[model samples]
Target: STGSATTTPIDSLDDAYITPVQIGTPAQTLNLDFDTGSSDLWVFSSETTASEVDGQTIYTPSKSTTAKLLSGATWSISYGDGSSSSGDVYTDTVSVGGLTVTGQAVESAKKVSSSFTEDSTIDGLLGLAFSTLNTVSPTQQKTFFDNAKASLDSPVFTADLGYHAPGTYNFGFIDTTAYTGSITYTAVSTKQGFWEWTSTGYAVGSGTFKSTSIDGIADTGTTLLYLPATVVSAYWAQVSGAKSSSSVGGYVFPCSATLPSFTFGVGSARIVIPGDYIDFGPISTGSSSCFGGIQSSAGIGINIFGDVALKAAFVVFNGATTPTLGFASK
Candidate 1:
């Protein structure tokens, strides 16, 4: 077996894609957000306060015969959007798809931020970043991918996330059939626990491709594309009713406006993002206003090629050697 798993998107906010994962001895199944941007496999569990439980499925450690407590171990993580989770640590059997890892460190969340509490579908988060980013204190934990990599035929995984549809995530082997054309390769920087890379430049609609270096991360958890302020300004300029609305906290535009396709450069290859994807659904149900998927990465200091940019291509996260990113049009 190449050790693979396929994930389907949930019909919630569409900001994340959830996958099934089993934890503990008898296999308590939970829906998890497989995030490539951060490193922590924490889940809502019995430890969580009753008030904070909401509608999330909790992992019951007591029911799992193989679950063991890592005394004195603790973890806490905060996302860029300010949502956070904290919990104690445990070692247990964890499985994704058909791949299983024995003694996988699982963070059982005892607390979560308001954002996570409101979104009841997400039971936990499965971190796909390098194990070095694990937040467990006293001892850094290894991710499920790292623990299972030694047994895989090849240390690579492909993320095929789609918009309002079903997509698949493959591990250990590349299904060449998932993408078209050759996979464009780029150098990546893992120093910050993310698949950070630099784009040679980008273009607004059918405009000339500007050759500028934009540093950003390929984040599966993020919902939109975040770029440099100037780039966002240039792209939104082409929209007639576009404006930076403080009430909305980002760029809002009339749903009837014509949106131009945005193209990103990777070396000599050009990957285009269709304008339709730029309209991130309606700002509010039954409203004519919609949020622009492209936002300014001003305060963050780095651009983020979130799902908005990622769903347009087949992405390969290579971990065998120095981490490299491969992308191709779907």
Candidate 2:
């Protein structure tokens, strides 16, 4: 069985994408961030500290007849932004679009950080990365994708993340209309629990392509594109008045300055990130300088092709015996 779901950006900058998910027997619908970098299908729930909830909805297990406690199972996870959540585990009916998976572990959050509490748009996170990354203890649960893949037409899913608009996440099949040109297929390394792949090189605007190898992960959970410091600095150099600042944190440049499109290679194909996408918007309201969408992954220990890059093309996550990733320009 195949399923298709719509995912939308929270704002114009497309910092994150959220999709609706149905949990429990009666089906409590919640808007959740589909994170390709994470592997825990956690949610804000009835068991959470009442004070921690702002405008987000919580899943109440007591309301679902099909819900069962996965007793002794607990989970804790943290993000790069310092946001975190911890909770007890339970299994229940879970559905995404038209596809349904029974006995899906629906982690109910008991404690959440200020970052999550303050974000009213996001109810929780649905992990799409490898199940090996799940943080649940006592009995690590499989991700919704892992459990559902067996019944799908093909053990695959695609991400069509849009810029300032709604895109789709398709399960069990690929939507031919979702992309243009033939897809460029590449190997993925799940060793570190990511849809990790390598890029042959990059080109800034119309400049000549650099043949250096760059390895990174396709992470929809992250907001911006991160690469080696050398590559990052080279791209920013083309724009006058651009500089790395400690005050603003990362690279910032004059708002009047035009951004150059970034191009990266996969096999013999190239995916281009439009110039406007790199204009991440002003650091603060009414500020004359804007933060760059591309930044250095130097201290972070890994490069990430986050939302900024993923949204530029169609992405396929092949969950075969040996996983592969496919990228196509649209």
Candidate 3:
């Protein structure tokens, strides 16, 4: 279709938002997490061990007349959060919003890690990263978006994640009505199978913006923003009672600590992250202790602009020849 589709949140699991997608002949709808960090469209299915299957809705391929198995084909994946899943492959009719792609590879989970089993609300994961990252062996599979892009008016998709609110994920065309002001574009590198880009610089509050180039990925599946340890320490330093709490596993501050804004450079465009957003609420209710949303990327190698950072802007994921990221204030 030439138009775009709107995706909304389906659960209250902290930072995890999902969209409804249909699969198979009669269309079995499932709430799947759209993860830009990985590329493998897998689902909980009848093949999943009964003991391992918790409250997730399983997809029954036998119920769909059009479902067909790809002989000897399989897929497996693991996330940064330690969640993992693997299974055999099947081809089925998969559709999102109004876009439909027949014979799309839908991995059926045979084994899932405890993380997936515990998160009952998340039935599956729809990977939005480049198809090059797809885990299907013997033959790499294309993502739903990759299979549908050829028929789209434009090879583009936009993510507008809100703070504890339902947001939209649009595809095919950029909806001018969803964002304000001009969109500042930044070139992206997909060599690593991610929406990777470089930040010209960053600043803590009104201080001088340092010209330190930071390379990072825009990951929708991730929850918090991650930067270098030094950067994380510097930002927390501005808060009166903020400290690196080993007990808390990150920087913790008094609930009433005064926070400062964070700014990053996208060419000349200054994407300002509000101070309030950095305060990720209290570590626990009534504890009067809060956890800083920004943390260290020390072990991770690359920084991540997760939901916390992305919620502050309207993001355009252009998948054309020269992939680029367009950002604008919501």
Candidate 4:
């Protein structure tokens, strides 16, 4: 009734975290991005052209005896970064960690963008967001989590994301042992097809709290945390030599600057992102310029509480009678 999967960061920068997913009857295992920001369980597949295939594992439906073509079904999607993919669709027995689901849509990629092809760290993406975001035309498919909800002990899943360390994604049950202190619950807006919620406020290091509610989405698919310009400016101002660079992009500062910690509220509890976690890494190799993990959401339109924020706390995505979010110290 419950499932637990190990997720790992692909590189030192923790650009993306991926978990292994089992598809087909014999289990064609592929490491996929467990994205909370999108809904479409797609994978690099044999349907794709040879040139588009890089070092990433491809899901070959032809090899699976249980694979059944979803007649006339197709899917396509464009992401925030402009990378896109489209392909044929099939229903196959899919497994994540210990949980299993029959007839889960295994979108087979026929085409992919250069960004996806260049990043061999991930085979595809396993969406945990709402099913409304599913891109299948003529017949929209349910996400793996949505389909598995019925049989789950409780219609809930938890995400315990870590920095460079391996974390876990648990379905059907909250692993209380994975986190410290009590889990603080909060409401979320699902109309936008994201885990969108209001954060009570934020503080830079040990500074006074702003006591303002900021609307944002908890997105695992995104790499960094984005907030309003005012917040970003206030935080970056404390760092020596920190400047919002138009040429290099984003907020950059001296590599040796003593970065301050960040704190955001979830109900009455506050989840703190350590100073080290905000160090996005050097802007260029051997350069003294380092980028910040926090940026302005002015261009993005909507604020994003991505890996930088999620990794600092244990997050729970409740899909029961009412959608809610839980945050806890870890």
lDDT scores of the candidates, listed in order: 0.89, 0.94, 0.87, 0.94
Q: What does candidate 1's lDDT look like per residue over 216-266, in tens digits?
A: 999898888999989999999999989999899999999888799999988
Cα-based lDDT at residue 104, candidate 1: 96
Clashing pairs in 3: none
Cα-based TM-score, every candidate? 0.97, 0.99, 0.95, 0.99
| Candidate 1 stretches greater than 4 Å from native | none
Instruction: Kindly list the per-residue Cα lDDT of model 3 for residues 1-330, writing each as its tens digit.
Output: 743445555444346787888999898998899988888999999999888888999899999998999999999898887789999999999988878889899999999999888888889999999999999998999998898888888999889887667788888888888778889999899999999999888899999988888899999989889999988888988899898888878888998877899988887787888887787777887889988889999978889988878888899999998999989887
The model with the greater lDDT, 1 or 2, is 2
What does each candidate score in C-alpha RMSD? 1.3, 0.7, 1.7, 0.8
Q: List model 4 lDDT by residue over 1-330, tens digit each.
A: 988999999999889899999999899999999999999999999899889988999999989999999999999999876899999899999999999999999999999999999999999999999999999988999999999999999999998988989999999999979899999999999999999999999999999887899999999999899999999999999998999999988999999998999999998789999988889788989888999999999998899999999999999999977899999999
The CA lDDT at 219 in model 3 is 92
Residue pairs that clash (backbone atoms under 3 angstroms), model 4: none
The alpha-carbon deviation from the true structure for residue 140 of candidate 1, after best TM-score superposition, in angstroms, is 0.7
Q: Indicate the residue-level lDDT of 281 in model 1.
A: 65
Ranking by TM-score: 2, 4, 1, 3
> lDDT for model 1, on a 0 to 1 scale?
0.89
Q: Report the C-alpha displacement of residue 328, candidate 4, in angstroms.
A: 0.2
Candidate 4: give its CA RMSD in angstroms.
Answer: 0.8
